[PDB]
C-alpha cells in the first residue's frame, strides 16, 4: 500500500512566563516515532518507537540540531505574526506547522505538503505543485511574497521529493514489523436496556491498525447514519486503535439491525448481527 511521513510542530507564546513552548512530533503512517518538547529535560529529539531507537548518534545529533533550528524559527515567527496583526503583548498565541510526504505502493514519491496556521486558522500553504503558495489573508500575503522571492518553495520541493521519501523508505524498512503490518479489528456487539421498550446496540472494533476504518449501522439494509452515535477513532495507547458505533433500538427489533465493518486488515467486510 501507500505510506506517509508527517511532522507536526506547535509553538505557543507564554508572555511573562518564559520562552514560547515548542513541541514537535513525527509520524510514519499512524505510528509516532519521534518527539521534541522544549520543556523536557533532555533538550534532544527523542525516540517514540522501538524501531527508531537504534538509529545511532549521527541521526539523533542531526535531528536535535535541526529541531532546535525549527524551534528558533518559530520563536521569531510568533513575534513577527504579532507584528503583522498588531496584537497585544500580553496574549498567548499559537503557530502550527505540518509537513510531510507520501509514497505509492511502489514506494515512489506520490505527493508532498507543507501547511502553516496561526491561532488555529490556515495561514499559508504549499500548493500541490510544490512551486507556489496559497495565502489565507492579507497578512499571509506578506509571507507569500517573501517566500516567493526567497525561493523557499524550491527548497521544500527538494526536501519533499528527496530526503523526505528517502528516509520514509528507510523507516519503513527499519520498522517493517511495526509499520508494514495490518491488525484487523477484533469486533463484538453489546446490548444494554435503556428502558423497558428500548435498548442500546453497540458495535465495537478493537485493537486495529492502521486507524482508518468504517463502522456503520443498518436497519433492514438502510443506513442509519443519522441515528448512529459514532465516537472518534481513539488510540488504545499501545499503537492500536479503537472505535464504536451505537444505535438505540426499540426492544424487540434487534434482528433488523446489522453493523458493517470495513478495514484494510479484513479479507472482506464484516457484517455483525445480534443473534
Amino acid at each position: 500500500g501507500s505510506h506517509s511521513m508527517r511532522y507536526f510542530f506547535t509553538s505557543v507564546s507564554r508572555p511573562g512566563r518564559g520562552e514560547p513552548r515548542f513541541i514537535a512530533v513525527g509520524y510514519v503512517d499512524d505510528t509516532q516515532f519521534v518527539r521534541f518538547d522544549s520543556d523536557a529535560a533532555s533538550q534532544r529529539m527523542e525516540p517514540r518507537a522501538p524501531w527508531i531507537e537504534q538509529e545511532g548518534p549521527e541521526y539523533w545529533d542531526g535531528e536535535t540540531r535541526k529541531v532546535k533550528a525549527h524551534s528558533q524559527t518559530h520563536r521569531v515567527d510568533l513575534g513577527t505574526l504579532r507584528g503583522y496583526y498588531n496584537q497585544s503583548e500580553a496574549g498567548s498565541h499559537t503557530v502550527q506547522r505540518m509537513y510531510g510526504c507520501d509514497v505509492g505502493s511502489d514506494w515512489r514519491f506520490l505527493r508532498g505538503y507543507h501547511q502553516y496556521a496561526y491561532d488555529g486558522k490556515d495561514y499559508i500553504a504549499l500548493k500541490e505543485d510544490l512551486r507556489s503558495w496559497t495565502a489565507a489573508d492579507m497578512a499571509a500575503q506578506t509571507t507569500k511574497h517573501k517566500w516567493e522571492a526567497a525561493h523557499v518553495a524550491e527548497q521544500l520541493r527538494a526536501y519533499l521529493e528527496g530526503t523526505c521519501v528517502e528516509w520514509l523508505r528507510r523507516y519503513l524498512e527499519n520498522g517493517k514489523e511495526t509499520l508494514q503490518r495490518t491488525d484487523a479489528p477484533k469486533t463484538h456487539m453489546t446490548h444494554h436496556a435503556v428502558s423497558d421498550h428500548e435498548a442500546t446496540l453497540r458495535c465495537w472494533a478493537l485493537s486495529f491498525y492502521p486507524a482508518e476504518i468504517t463502522l456503520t449501522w443498518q436497519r433492514d439494509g438502510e443506513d442509519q447514519t443519522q441515528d448512529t452515535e459514532l465516537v472518534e477513532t481513539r488510540p488504545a495507547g499501545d499503537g492500536t486503535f479503537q472505535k464504536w458505533a451505537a444505535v438505540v433500538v426499540p426492544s424487540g427489533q434487534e434482528q433488523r439491525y446489522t453493523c458493517h465493518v470495513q478495514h484494510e486488515g479484513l479479507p472482506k467486510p464484516l457484517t455483525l448481527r445480534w443473534e
Binding site: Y7, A24, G26, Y59, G62, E63, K66, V67, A69, H70, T73, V76, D77, T80, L81, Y99, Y116, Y123, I124, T143, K146, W147, A150, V152, Q155, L156, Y159, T163, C164, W167
Partner: peptide
C-alpha cells in the same frame, strides 16, 4: 528526517 534550513514568516 526533518527539513533544514527552516524559513521565517
Amino acid at each position: 528526517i526533518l527539513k533544514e534550513p527552516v524559513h521565517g514568516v
